Amino acid sequence: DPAKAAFNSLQASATEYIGYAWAMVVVIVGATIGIKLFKKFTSKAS
Amino acid sequence: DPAKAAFNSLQASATEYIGYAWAMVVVIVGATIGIKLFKKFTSKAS
Amino acid sequence: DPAKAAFNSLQASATEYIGYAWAMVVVIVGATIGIKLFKKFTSKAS
Amino acid sequence: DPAKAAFNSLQASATEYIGYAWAMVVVIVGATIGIKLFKKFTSKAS
Amino acid sequence: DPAKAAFNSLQASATEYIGYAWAMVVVIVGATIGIKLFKKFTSKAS
Amino acid sequence: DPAKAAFNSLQASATEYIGYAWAMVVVIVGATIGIKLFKKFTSKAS
Amino acid sequence: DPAKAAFNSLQASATEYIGYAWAMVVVIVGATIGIKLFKKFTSKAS
Amino acid sequence: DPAKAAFNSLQASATEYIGYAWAMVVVIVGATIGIKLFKKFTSKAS
Amino acid sequence: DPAKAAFNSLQASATEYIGYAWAMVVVIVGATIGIKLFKKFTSKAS
Amino acid sequence: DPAKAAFNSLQASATEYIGYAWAMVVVIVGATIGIKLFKKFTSKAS
Amino acid sequence: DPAKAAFNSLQASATEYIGYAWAMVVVIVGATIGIKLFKKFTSKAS
Amino acid sequence: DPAKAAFNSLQASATEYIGYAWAMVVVIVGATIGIKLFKKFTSKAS
Amino acid sequence: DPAKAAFNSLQASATEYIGYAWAMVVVIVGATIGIKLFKKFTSKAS
Amino acid sequence: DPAKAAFNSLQASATEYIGYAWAMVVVIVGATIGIKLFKKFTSKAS
Amino acid sequence: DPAKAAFNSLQASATEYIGYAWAMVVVIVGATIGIKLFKKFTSKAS
Amino acid sequence: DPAKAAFNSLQASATEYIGYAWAMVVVIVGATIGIKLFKKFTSKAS
Amino acid sequence: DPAKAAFNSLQASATEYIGYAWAMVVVIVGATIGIKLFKKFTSKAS
Amino acid sequence: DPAKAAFNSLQASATEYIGYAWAMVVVIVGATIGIKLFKKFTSKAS
Amino acid sequence: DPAKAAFNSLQASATEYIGYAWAMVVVIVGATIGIKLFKKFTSKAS
Amino acid sequence: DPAKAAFNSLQASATEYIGYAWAMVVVIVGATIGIKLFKKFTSKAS
Amino acid sequence: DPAKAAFNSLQASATEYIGYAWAMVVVIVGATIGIKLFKKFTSKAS
Amino acid sequence: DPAKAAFNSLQASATEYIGYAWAMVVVIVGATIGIKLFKKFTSKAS
Amino acid sequence: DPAKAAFNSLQASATEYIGYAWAMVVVIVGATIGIKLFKKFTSKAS
Amino acid sequence: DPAKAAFNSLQASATEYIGYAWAMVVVIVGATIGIKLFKKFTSKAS
Amino acid sequence: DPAKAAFNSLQASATEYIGYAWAMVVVIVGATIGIKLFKKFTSKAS
Amino acid sequence: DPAKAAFNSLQASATEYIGYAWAMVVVIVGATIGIKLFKKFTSKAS
Amino acid sequence: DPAKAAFNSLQASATEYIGYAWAMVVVIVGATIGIKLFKKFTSKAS
Amino acid sequence: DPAKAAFNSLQASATEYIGYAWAMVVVIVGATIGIKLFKKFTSKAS
Amino acid sequence: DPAKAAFNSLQASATEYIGYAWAMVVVIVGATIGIKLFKKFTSKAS
Amino acid sequence: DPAKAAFNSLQASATEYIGYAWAMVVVIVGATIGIKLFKKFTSKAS
Amino acid sequence: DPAKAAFNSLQASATEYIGYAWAMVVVIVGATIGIKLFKKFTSKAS
Amino acid sequence: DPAKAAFNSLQASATEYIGYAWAMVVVIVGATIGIKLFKKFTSKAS
Amino acid sequence: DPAKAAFNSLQASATEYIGYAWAMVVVIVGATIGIKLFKKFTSKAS
Amino acid sequence: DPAKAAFNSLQASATEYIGYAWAMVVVIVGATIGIKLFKKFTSKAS
Amino acid sequence: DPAKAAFNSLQASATEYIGYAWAMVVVIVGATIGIKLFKKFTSKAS
Amino acid sequence: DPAKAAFNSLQASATEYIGYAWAMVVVIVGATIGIKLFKKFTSKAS
Amino acid sequence: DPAKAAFNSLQASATEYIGYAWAMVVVIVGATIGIKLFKKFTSKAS
Amino acid sequence: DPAKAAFNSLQASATEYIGYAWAMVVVIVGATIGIKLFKKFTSKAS
Amino acid sequence: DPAKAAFNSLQASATEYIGYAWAMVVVIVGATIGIKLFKKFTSKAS
Amino acid sequence: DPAKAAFNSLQASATEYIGYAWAMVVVIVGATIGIKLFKKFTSKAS
């Protein structure tokens, strides 16, 4: 049954895309929150 | 009749295909909602 | 029903995100208030 | 989970930022309080 | 008539989906409003 | 003439589909509008 | 015309949401003004 | 209607938040007014 | 109108707040003037 | 002409929905603006 | 056209809110100015 | 316009405040001048 | 050509909406500035 | 030729269908834009 | 242009507020200077 | 060639539609900015 | 081009608003500074 | 009006102070005059 | 005019003290001149 | 401006105060000098 | 009411501070008047 | 530029206030010096 | 390639829009900063 | 061969259709982008 | 609820903060009062 | 091969469009950030 | 009333100083008159 | 200059006071010297 | 760049404001110091 | 798999953009805090 | 059979088209995401 | 990549605005501190 | 409360200061009276 | 700087004030000394 | 907790200033008191 | 982490600002206390 | 670094202001002490 | 810490003024006592 | 405590000044008494 | 230092006034002693 192997391949590819997207979004959100917190804490500390 | 047996086989195949489709939808929607909630809660927490 | 398991998985995942968000909220709010109270009391006492 | 690690990394980054803010505000607050006390006491003494 | 039962089953599935969505949205909205009110009342109290 | 009965039969049998479709839309739309207003008013109420 | 009944149901449903929102506003607003007036009048009285 | 219960939980939570806010503001205000009165009265007596 | 009750409720609290402020300010002012008059009238007579 | 009779039926139905929609908008918008004005005017007066 | 009626109702609600806000602000301003004038004239007279 | 009534009430209130301030200052000044003249004339006559 | 007529009708409705909006803005801004100036001049005079 | 008369008959039918379609669009577009501008101006009016 | 009329009305209201504030400040300053001069001249003559 | 006339007519027909759109956009935008500046300049002038 | 004309009209409206705001702020600032100078010089003269 | 009651409270207390000052000043002045007259008359007579 | 009455009362009190002091000084001077003249006359006559 | 009228009013009030002060000081100085000259001349003559 | 207890707690403390201040001022004044009377009566008697 | 005209008006008003203040202080100081010199020279002459 | 000319035309229109926006920004910011500096320096100088 | 001539004729027809379509898309997109940038720069400028 | 611990952590920290403020203000007041009494008593005694 | 040539042509066209879009985005972003920074720094400097 | 005890205690204290002052002056005066009478009686006898 | 006018006015008033004081002292000294020389010459003649 | 020209114009305007403020403050300071020195020297001269 | 290469290139571009953004934020925030601290410390020192 | 050759040729052509489409998707997505993050980071940084 | 050039240009522009803002703020702060110090020193010296 | 301890410490310090001041005033007054009595008695005795 | 010119104007004004005060004081002192010397010489020579 | 260290450093620094203030006041007070007795005792001794 | 370096640079700039502010305040306080002590000791010496 | 130059210019301006203040206070104090010593020595010598 | 150096500098300067004040008061008291003793001894010896 | 050291130092200095005060007075008194008996005894013996 | 020059100038002025006062007192004392000795010697001659 080729459909079985095709679905496994599609699910594996989707999981790989999920992993890469998670890495990218983690990097972007980390940068954004870092900048926001830096500005906020610098304004409040001074 | 062979037509009835073919119909039963097609119903079983359709159920199996719906099984893979449901699994793929679950994983993809889980990833999407996880990313959305991560961004939302991270932005609101800061 | 795969839908029943799917919705339950997202609800459990969302609860974890709320827990992580609440952990980050407390440390941020505690620092901001601690600085403001420190600046307010040191000016009143002096 | 990718999300669990990301939330913890942000909390560590936020906690690190609080340390810098406290160090900076202590230096700033000490200057304003010290000048206030210096001007107050130099006039009371005379 | 298969159409009657099919429509009724789809309507029941829709109602079940509405129930799950309502539970999830109540959880998320409760968390968000809790964080917002916590920040607001903490700022007003000090 | 069986033909005129056939045209009547489909038109008569059709109406139930519009009846059930209309009932299905109300519960689907009611959930969508219900969640939309719940998030809208709780956000402004806070 | 099920749509005529459906619109009336939504208008009745939306009216209830306004009732809950108004009850939530008055308790929150009263607490905000109550703290603000308490802080203002104690400073004036002293 | 799940929405009615959802609004009640938020209103109950909001009232709980108000009690904590009122309790906290009393302590902070009482300290500032106490210090203000202490410095004011010690100058008159001296 | 729900707002009409809210505005009347807030004004009722404000007048209640004013009474407490007036009660406290009389006690504080009376003490300050009494000490001031005691110091003034004692030095003049002695 | 079946089309001309049909077009009037849909056009008349469209006028009905606009009437019900306009009634719903007034209720929702009036509540939103009322709360916005209530929060704005209360803070200024206090 | 419902728009004109909605606008008129909104304007009436705004005027009523303005009236309540004016009453409250007159009360509060009168209280504060009375306290200030009392403490200034008592200081001057003695 | 409530502003005219508020200003008139405030001016009237300032008027009776001035009245009591004058009533108290007349008594205080009379007492002080009486003591001064008593001690001056007793010293001179004796 | 009915497109031009529709465009003109929408333009006229927009102009009417601008009229109502301008009336409401004048009322609200007048009330707010009146309250602000009343408080400012009252605090300055006393 | 019967053919040349036919297309004119269909063309004549095409003219009337467009006539009602244009009439239908204006009331729907007017309702959509009228509500959209109503929400915009009232929000900015406050 | 309703904006020009609004500006004119606001300027007129500001002028009336200026008049009321001037009257009140004249009364207050007159009373205070009268008390001060009464005390000074009574002390000097005695 | 009817194709050239058809495209030219459609291209020509788009010209005044842009004209009506541009005419309406200026009216709407001028209303929005006029209100926005009126609120901004009135607050700063006070 | 309509855009250039719209921009020029907006700039002209802004200039008129600036003129009105300048007149209002000159009036208000003159009044406040006159009151302050009156109080200061009246206190100094006595 | 609490202010009127407060003003008479101070004046009633201020009246008591004058009685206390007058009682003591007669004793002190009586002693000063008595010693002076004693020294004057014992020398002139002798 | 409170100043008129206060000054008149102060002048009347001053006149009363002047009268009492005049009586006392007449008594004292009479006694002193009498004893001195008595001593002188007895010394000379002998 | 009301400033000119206020300045004239306080100047006239001050002149009236000088009149009363001059009357009182003339009376007091006359009494004191009369007593002193009486005691000097009765001491010298005898 | 959270504020009703809060106001009373401050007033209860405020009265206590008055008791502490009145005890301290009596001690200070007793030395000031005692030293003044000691130097006054020693010089006269000696 | 309205700024130059506003500043010139403010400076002219300030200078006129200066003139009034000088006119008042001359009278007050003349009265004080006259009373002082009258008492001094009457004491020395007698 | 008409797209090249289209992109050039869009860039030119955007540049014209930037020019108009910059002119309007200069005017508005100049007016606002002028008002702010006028108020600040007028308050500081007096 | 008529086939080659037909292919060339339809190729030229397609080329001119692409030309007209390119012109239409250029003008429509230019209008849309002009309106969008007009609104954007007008909102940002004010 | 994470909010219950969050408010207690801040409220406990605020109570801790007041302790240092009360400790420092006693040290500051002790020096200011001590110097004031030292300069007062050495001047009176000498 | 027409296929590879067509694909390369589309790739080159996409690259050219990307370059032109990047240029336009650079212009728009530069203008917007320039205006934002101008307003921010002008407000902060003053 | 703390003031009642304070004045009464001081008046009692002043009485003690009067007693000591009266006691010491008799010793001093007795010496002065004693020596003067001693010298004058011996000179007249001798 | 107001200062110069005030200074010479005060100098003129001082000169008049000097003249009056000189006249009075001449009268008093004349009387005293006359009576003293009268007594001295009558005693010497005897 | 338009921004550089705008900054230069704002700086020039600020310098002009500084000049006006300097002139006004020189006038006011001269007046106040002249009055204070006049009082001081007329008090010292007598 | 071109997807992995595309994801890696996109993440690298994101990281480089983050670096440039961090540099820009550092510069801007440094300038802002520098201006704020300069104006704070200059105000405190004077 | 020619079937295998046809299938293999179609598969190879499909693979080549997939590769070309993948390259086109990579470049287009890279450009789009680059512009998106450029705008995001320039907006956040400012 | 145009992104690097765009970021560098934006950073250079931000540096230029920083320089202009620093110049303007130095000028304004210098003027304000000059006025403040002038008033303080002319009040102290005289 | 730390306020009670602070007040008690202040009162104890005041008592100590009173003791030292009493010692100094007794010794100084004793020396002064000794010198005065020495001079007086050596004058009278001889 | 205008500060140097203001300082020089204030110093010239002070020098003029000093000269006026010296003239007034020397006249007053000469008159006082002449009166004293006349009295002394009439007591001595006669 | 950085705050506990920060408060202790401020309290420790405040104690250091009190040491310098007490050292300086003793030197100043000793000079002023020493001069007063030098002038007091020299006049009494001689 | 560029944020750590940015925080360090900001703290260094703050330390430099503190040094400059300390120098300026030392100079200003030295001048003020020098003038005060000069005036006080000059008055005491004479 | 513009901050260093700004601070240096501010300190230089402060030093020049200190010099001017010293120049003025020397003259004022010299005049006051000259008048005081002139009066003292002319009263003692005569 | 510059504060300690500033305190030491002020103490040294204060010692310097104390030295000059002591020299001046020694000169003044020497001259005064010399004149008084000269007059006393010339009166006694002659 | 620094206060105890200061008071003892002042008392030690005060006792020190008394020693020189008694040293000088006996020298002056012995001279005045010595010259007095010298004039008394020689006249009586002769 | 300005203090050095000011103190030296004041000491020189004090010495000048001392010399002038010495000359005046020598003249006056010589005249008085001459008159008294002349009266004594002529009395002793007769």
Author numbering:
A (entry chain O), B (entry chain X), C (entry chain BA), D (entry chain CA), E (entry chain Y), F (entry chain FA), ...: 5 to 50
Report text from the authors:
Filamentous bacteriophages package their circular, single stranded DNA genome with the major coat protein pVIII and the minor coat proteins pIII, pVII, pVI, and pIX. Here, we report the cryo-EM structure of a ~500 Å long bacteriophage M13 mini variant. The distal ends of the mini phage are sealed by two cap-like complexes composed of the minor coat proteins. We further performed local refinements of the mini phage by dividing the particle into the top, middle and bottom three segments.
To determine the structure of the inner ssDNA genome, we performed further classifications using the middle segment by searching for the orientation among the five equivalent positions. After several round of classifications, we observed a right-handed double helix structure of the DNA genome in the middle segment. The two strands are well separated and presumably correspond to the phosphate backbones of the DNA genome. However, densities for the bases are missing in the reconstructions. The pitch of the double helix structure is ~28 Å for the top two turns and is ~31 Å for the bottom two turns. The pitch is consistent with that of the A-form dsDNA, which has a pitch of ~28 Å and a diameter of ~23 Å. The segment with clear double helix structure starts from layer 8 of pVIII, ends around layer 16 of pVIII, and has a length of ~140 Å. Analysis of the asymmetric density map of the middle segment showed that K43, K44, and K48 of some pVIIIs in layers 8–16 have significant asymmetric features and are in close proximity to the densities of the ssDNA, suggesting possible direct interactions of these Lys residues with presumably the phosphate groups of the ssDNA phosphate-sugar backbone. The asymmetric conformation also indicates possible induced conformational changes of the inner surface Lys residues upon binding the ssDNA. The asymmetric interactions establish a unique relationship between the capsid and the ssDNA genome and stabilized the conformation of the ssDNA, which may have been preformed in the genome-pV complex.
